[PDB]
């Protein structure tokens, strides 16, 4: 339900890919790990996954 600024990092937890997100217009203290299925940011995921 929130705009995503950028993906900071990626991990696997409990067999799920999770991304650590900076949320647009929120402080870095609000950064959270979210499971990949929670994202609708194809362009960011591909840009992250291509450049990592």
């Amino acid at each position: 339900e929130y705009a995503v600024e950028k993906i900071i990092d990626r991990r696997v937890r409990k067999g799920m890919v999770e991304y650590y997100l900076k949320w647009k217009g929120y402080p870095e203290t609000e950064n959270t790990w979210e499971p990949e299925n929670n994202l609708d940011c194809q362009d960011l995921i591909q840009q992250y996954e291509a450049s990592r």
Partner: peptide, 6 residues
């Protein structure tokens, strides 16, 4: 360019 907040 959005995501759900778990």
């Amino acid at each position: 360019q959005t995501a759900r907040k778990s």
